[PDB]
């Protein structure tokens, strides 16, 4: 006892202790090892159970299929449902192999006498296993030679393609042996596939008669979600709607003093008016965001709010509860402060003072949300609040509804970054940013899966916190290109808003913030103007979105490989749907100047086709056909395009294995 | 729950379900995850515990150190009885180094007054885990902070290093939170570092008037124990000293008719005579092994007996237990047979119609070696039984006697090889005959450690059944690269005999089979002579264990390191002990013929020098001393010598450091 070793299954995270990430349609596959004494045979069958919903902390069975790598067992399954799965595998040894196996090795070279009365004494034993019905051809198996004569008589009723596939669906197995039980949570498919927008809802005012920005309402913003959905976005991501705070509140570019007209952060969460559940008045009332939200919903959209879990002074948490602040001798509470950014205008929290008592509020403020049709948060800079807390908050949330999901802005070294997802943050931020040189993206690429079991990217083009040096001085050439790597890279991409006009301008050189930043100031955007004067991306960020819808293969987590192009500026990458075969490859260059050329080299195994092998090719942008093979030559035009986003021959139904591990 | 987070712990091994592999007097590290929230310190301590001698199914704190990784703590422990030992980490939040760090950058900067105060409840509250009279100092500096002043006056004993070590000593620790325990299994350091010589009872025979080889004896084979110690080996193993089936006995060179005279396989084990208990009685009466095993005592050397769970039709079990069998419908019992090698001479056992009953004979007969000085097996062909057998084996008898031990010859991919050490086997046999290419033996050279947590190889030059074609016509030279190969990549090897004679004739080109092998036909050998005519390896071997028992770093798994050397015949790696501080480095060629030069880069980081260091070094084979810096000019003779091992200068006290991960 284990009688058959059973060892190194995946996907496990954490030896067990959290549960695997999926969602509804994925392929899951999964792999063990499997051994046993001798060349004696052996085999393994995946069982999944289907748990209720329910949040950690009759059964489907599949066969395994050997491979490559000697005694290691491969297999797959796909959850149709939310909630909790289970998968452990059960490892056996089977007998009819073995034997089958041996006879015709025997067979070949004509006595055995032996052996056949042993088949004879298997089948049988099958038989009872299998339902009268049935079970009747093995006995005409079992019994044509125990009656003496030649061998090649009986072998007839063997070596028929009809008692294996019987034998299939009913197995002979021997040392039952189960493993280990390990657990899927399986999210909706949007918790892995969808495109996000972040919008602030009061830049969009719309300047009055004098050329000065007016503060927008619930009301106007929900105006402008039809472009939004227009440009293929499934989420739209607000910062937070709260009233912002009135002490120490920040003025323009981060200035420390704040004019009378002036808006604040509003991540300055709190005042007079009102805390985490109330609506700054300024938007609206109440019932207007349940309007804002019903018109996204009618767009097919998504709304996702900033959780921050900080407070302003003027916030009632202030005077109403104090025990949760860390308050200094002279009884002032300090300032949030985040290494070396220095938060003025916010108090953090302290959550082991009065821990069940904060963490019962906040899980109230998440409750409210969740009650007004809001099932996707942000939560913003999880890493400076106890891990405990989200892992109880996470789970305390999705299991009275299951479809709550989370997005941790964890800018972060791994060992944190990582980790968060692990509790059960559903998509996590990423240091793609930060990634743009052939080799770094390659690297950040790879990584992505690897990591799929508990991490999944949320890529940001830009965030209000972050424009990326290779934005400010590249011109709109580049903004294609991050938007061509987010889009492709990862399922689940995104932009914060005005990244189409490009904006590229930072507050002083060396920096990564937005001069004249939204967060401090009302940003009326003319969209439409752009679009007229042919100075808007807001097309190409279309014709991406679209693409994904089209192919599956970019709802993909898992299969990105990488393909050789000698050209250090050029990268190609594909990616392939388990299910449906799909399969598509991506060339960008990432220099935005100069026209780049190079021979590309496909790895064809990994396309599914041999060495030798001609195909067809489709231009997704541009609608061409071309014939290719293994090495093809490429050249890429900025100003013309940046990218060849190319429909590839689909991969054959050997899908399956292309994805294993 | 979980407050501050501990992950990724190391070494554990399949998630704990088997415990790690360490000796006495090796330093074991440790490394795990932990991280809290925000900038907030955190540290981490290893805790140690030694339970019992007892085997699987007054604390001891060490600090951890953080370092190159974020969030990533190291430490180690060096365990000093044979036994089971426990570690945990436990991670906490030390506020005082929060408060100190964050008051040096204010202390520069020049009221701040808050601070100051929050210091003081620090001290105190911290004092008051200290209340014994050596306390407090703090007070001091406790009441050297609070009365009201400036800040470098009141700064008195906090910055200067007096009560840092005291709170080294006794720390002020928040939130401490419990890390898994996991557990190393520690055994005699003969586990890890040993040299081991295969030798034939029965070929000590030597011939008698006419040249006819004479069948040997204990008493003669213990004459030949000096010669085996002078060459420094620690442990003598020999091939079954049982009695040999005469039924379907083997003839000389594998042909499967036995003349009246030959002698047979030894591992044909079982006659009428006796079993597995049974001393074969040409060899001599049970004392006699029992005064060979007090002789090899006496030199300083180890008697391992190999273990061969198979029987000849002959032996007693045969008739005695039956159910032990697989029997056929005719009655037979199919003959062993592992592919492509068929074993006519014997029977398989079956494990599965008599568990308990075989199991405990077993356990009897394995037992009754131990009672006879026998604390080393060599456990024969262990991936042809079933697994949980050994599993139960091993700890039913080493919870009886904890210095036993087990050397596994699983020659099988790797999910087995590997596996069957996870579950308990000391050491393993290793596909190390067939690495040699420079990039092969590289690689397999690293693998060590990496692997090194749960298994331990024994390097063998050569075995019965394994003459390697690259010893069949490289001619002496090769002799001695192998061995140089063998002795220094791993703390344990082996050679069986004669190959220190260069018997290099194999039975018919492309075999891997001695010729005229000693497993079925008897081969004394005169080693005096060859000796007398510079014909033998006999001295190098020495000189290589010597230096083998001189430098500590030969006898550590983990540490070894591969420096370049522009030359795909030269390879060259160097290992060094955590403990002294020793460091050796060798070179060795892979081609036996031709002299071969390059240039050697040292990767002086590795070797705990800077880039521009120079340093002398000396050859333990010559003695000769020179000067060498980051890179250096070698160049090997073969006939002359094949490698060139070299003494470096100790790595200094960073040596804890350079061991990590
Ligand atoms: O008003 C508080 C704080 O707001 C902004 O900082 C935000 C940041 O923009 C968000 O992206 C979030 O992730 O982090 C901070 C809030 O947690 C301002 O940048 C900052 O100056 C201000 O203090
Ligand atoms: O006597 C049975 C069998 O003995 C030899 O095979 C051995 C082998 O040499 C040992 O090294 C061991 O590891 O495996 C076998 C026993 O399990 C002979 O090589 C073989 O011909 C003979 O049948």
Chains 1, 2 share one sequence.
């Not at 329910?54 to 050997?66: A, E, F």
């Not at 106890?386 to 941790?408: E, M, Y």
């Not at 040189?437 to 990584?447: A, H, P, R, V």
Request: negative net charge; glycine residues 8%; aromatic residues 12%.
């Amino acid at each position: 006892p284990g009688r058959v070793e059973i060892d190194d299954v995946a996907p496990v995270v954490s030896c067990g202790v959290y549960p695997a990430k999926a969602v509804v349609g994925e392929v899951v596959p999964v792999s063990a090892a499997v051994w046993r004494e001798g060349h004696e045979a052996v085999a393994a069958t995946l069982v999944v159970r289907y748990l209720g919903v329910r949040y950690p902390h009759k059964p489907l069975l599949i066969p395994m299929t050997s491979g490559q790598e000697p005694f290691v067992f491969h297999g797959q399954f796909t959850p149709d449902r939310v909630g909790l799965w289970t998968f452990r595998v059960d490892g056996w040894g089977d007998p009819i192999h073995t034997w089958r196996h041996g006879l015709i090795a025997k067979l070949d070279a004509g006595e055995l006498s032996n052996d056949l009365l042993v088949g004879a004494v298997l089948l049988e034993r099958a038989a009872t296993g299998v339902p009268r019905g049935l079970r009747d051809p093995l006995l005409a198996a079992a019994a044509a030679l125990r009656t003496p004569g030649d061998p090649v008589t009986r072998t007839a009723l063997a070596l028929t393609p009809e008692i294996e596939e019987l034998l299939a669906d009913y197995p002979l197995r021997d040392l039952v042996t189960r493993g280990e039980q390990f657990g899927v949570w399986v999210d909706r498919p949007l918790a892995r596939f969808g495109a996000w927008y972040e919008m602030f809802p009061r830049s969009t005012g719309g300047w009055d008669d004098d050329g000065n920005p007016v503060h927008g309402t619930f009301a106007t913003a929900a105006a402008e979600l039809p472009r939004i959905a227009g440009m293929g976005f499934d989420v739209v991501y607000l910062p937070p709607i709260h009233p912002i705070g009135k002490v120490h509140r920040k003025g323009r570019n981060n200035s420390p003093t704040a004019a009378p007209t002036d808006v604040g952060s509003p991540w300055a969460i709190g005042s007079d008016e009102g805390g985490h559940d109330t609506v700054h008045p300024s938007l609206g009332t109440i019932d207007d965001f349940d309007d804002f939200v019903s018109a996204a919903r009618d767009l097919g959209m998504e709304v996702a709010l900033d959780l921050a879990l900080q407070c302003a002074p003027d916030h009632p948490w202030a005077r109403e509860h104090r025990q949760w602040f860390t308050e200094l001798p002279d009884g002032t509470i300090a300032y949030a402060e985040n290494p070396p950014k220095k938060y003025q205008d916010i108090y953090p929290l302290n959550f082991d003072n009065d821990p069940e008592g904060l963490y019962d509020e906040v899980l109230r403020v998440v409750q409210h949300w969740v009650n007004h049709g809001v099932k996707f948060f942000r939560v913003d800079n999880p890493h400076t609040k106890p891990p405990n807390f989200w892992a109880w908050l996470i789970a305390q949330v999705k299991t009275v509804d299951p479809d709550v999901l989370f997005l941790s802005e964890a800018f972060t070294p791994p060992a944190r970054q990582y980790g968060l997802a692990k509790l059960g943050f559903t998509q996590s931020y990423s240091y793609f940013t930060w990634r743009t040189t052939k080799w770094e993206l390659t690297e950040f690429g790879n990584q992505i899966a690897e990591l799929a079991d508990y991490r999944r990217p949320n890529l940001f083009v830009n965030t209000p916190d972050i424009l990326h040096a290779v934005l400010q001085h590249n011109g709109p050439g580049m903004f294609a290109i991050r938007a061509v790597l987010a889009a492709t890279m990862s399922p689940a991409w995104g932009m914060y808003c005005g990244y189409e006009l490009f904006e590229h301008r930072a507050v002083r050189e060396g920096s990564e913030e937005y001069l004249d930043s939204e967060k401090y100031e009302l940003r009326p955007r003319d969209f439409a103007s752009a679009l007229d004067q042919g100075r808007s991306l807001q097309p190409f960020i279309t014709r991406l979105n679209i693409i994904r819808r089209l192919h599956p293969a970019f709802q993909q987590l898992r299969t990105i490989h990488f393909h050789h192009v000698d050209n250090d500026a050029l990268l190609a990458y594909s990616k392939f749907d388990p299910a449906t075969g799909d399969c598509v490859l991506v060339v960008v260059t990432l220099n935005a100047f100069g026209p780049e050329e190079a021979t590309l080299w496909l790895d064809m195994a990994a396309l599914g086709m041999e060495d030798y092998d001609r195909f067809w090719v489709r231009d997704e942008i541009t609608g061409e056909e071309y014939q290719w093979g293994q090495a093809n030559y490429i050249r890429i035009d900025p100003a013309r395009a940046v990218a060849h986003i190319i429909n590839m021959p689909a991969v054959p139904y050997e899908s399956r294995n292309t994805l294993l591990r």
